[PDB]
Amino acid sequence: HMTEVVRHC
Amino acid sequence: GSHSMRYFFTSVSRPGRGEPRFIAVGYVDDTQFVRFDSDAASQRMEPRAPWIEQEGPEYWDGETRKVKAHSQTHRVDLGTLRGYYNQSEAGSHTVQRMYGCDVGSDWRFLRGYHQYAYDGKDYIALKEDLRSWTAADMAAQTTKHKWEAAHVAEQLRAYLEGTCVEWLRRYLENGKETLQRTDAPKTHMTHHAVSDHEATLRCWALSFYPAEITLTWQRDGEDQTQDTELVETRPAGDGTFQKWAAVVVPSGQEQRYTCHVQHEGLPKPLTLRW
Amino acid sequence: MIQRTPKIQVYSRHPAENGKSNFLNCYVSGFHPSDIEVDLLKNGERIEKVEHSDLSFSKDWSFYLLYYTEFTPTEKDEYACRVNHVTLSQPKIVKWDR
């Protein structure tokens, strides 16, 4: 189960 | 013992060749259970272990949704990083992310991690307290400032402490027969004459799981490290692992030497002689 | 940009016995970047049906892949693995040894 966090770096 | 879940993400830019390549894999301990390949035909998260097939269609529709969001973000990062480092648009560059949780023997939260690489070295990472960032670079500090402003750490922590371990436990239950097994190494030694003076002893460990294992040489009960050789632990292709260690001895002196094998599956460590 | 040249191991899934079905493996690891070229060879010629693992990597950040194919060993057939990578001057060939 992957995380929902995918913020641009 | 203790257990882990880990996700590995790779994005490789290819200039002139259209979109970047993106690969994603998921593991429990040493067993891979999911995949995604931007160049495969499915365009979905695919199962890689029998037991993950117990998951429903909302699982697959969620995982695919999220994996595509990871790719999309990593597609924007390749361009952001090229800027941060003032690089050309002509080279190929690589972004890697890894995250997941360790639980101990009681299946409770031990450790959580979330770390980023650019071109083969650290870029940014979440510290062990899961509430602050370690920038590897002056360049990473920009990234760190953006994530501090959007409270990313707090949402990552909730995942690592909560959702990560909850799903880890659930896989362990569901794939008990695979994931909680122990297959002890099958052990033997071999002998090959190099000269008239010297012989190579090689101590073998085959078909074991999990992948962790120690092989050590002793001479006359003392730890022997000189003139020895130890290969990296290597996948057999059927979910088990292999490894061997070798020592070069003087002719007639074979009997002084012992191989010692420690493995979750050997309560008592094995001693092999020639 | 940090580059590392891959290690190569050539070996079989099970103990080789001539006339029994098996798998021939070439494990490449510890490389970066990820792009690599791996080919299994029978007496010097390229095997056609060759699968490989899904790209993953180590705490190193360095990558690893398993290339593998079905085969039945003989007394006369020699096998090898052919690898090529930006860190190499020329492609490396590693012969299989029982």
Author numbering:
A (entry chain P): 1 to 9
B (entry chain A): 1 to 274
C (entry chain B): 1 to 98
What do the study's own words say?
Several TCRs have been isolated from TILs of epithelial cancer patients that recognize a neoepitope corresponding to residues 168–176 of p53R175H. This neoepitope includes the arginine-to-histidine mutation at position 175 (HMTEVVRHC). The TCRs are restricted by the common MHC class I allele HLA-A*02:01. The structures reveal how oligoclonal TCRs 12-6, 38-10, and 1a2 discriminate between wild-type and mutated p53, and demonstrate that there are multiple distinct solutions to recognizing the p53R175H neoepitope with sufficient affinity to mediate tumor cell killing.
To understand how the conservative arginine-to-histidine mutation in p53R175H, which replaces one positively charged amino acid by another, renders this peptide immunogenic, we determined the structures of the wild-type p53–HLA-A2 and mutant p53R175H–HLA-A2 complexes to 2.37 and 2.38 Å resolution, respectively. In both p53–HLA-A2 and p53R175H–HLA-A2, the peptide is bound in conventional orientation with the side chains of P2 Met and P9 Cys accommodated in pockets B and F, respectively, in the peptide-binding groove. The solvent-exposed side chains of P1 His, P4 Glu, P7 Arg, and P8 Arg/His project away from the peptide-binding groove and compose a highly featured surface for potential interactions with TCR. In particular, the wild-type and mutant p53 peptides are highly superimposable, except at the P8 mutation site. Detailed comparison of the mutant p53R175H–HLA-A2 and wild-type p53–HLA-A2 structures revealed that their conformations differ only at the P8 mutation site, where one positively charged residue (histidine) replaces another (arginine). Although replacement of histidine by arginine is conservative with respect to charge, these two amino acids differ markedly with respect to size and shape, which enables TCRs to distinguish between them. In the unbound p53R175H–HLA-A2 structure, the P8 His imidazole ring has one face against the side chain of Val76H of the HLA-A2 α1 helix, leaving its other face and most of its edge available for TCR binding. There are two adjacent water molecules under peptide residues P6–P8 in the wild-type p53–HLA-A2 and unbound mutant p53R175H–HLA-A2 structures. By contrast, these TCRs bound mutant p53R175H–HLA-A2 with dissociation constants (KDs) of 1.1 μM for 12-6, 39.9 μM for 38-10, and 16.2 μM for 1a2.
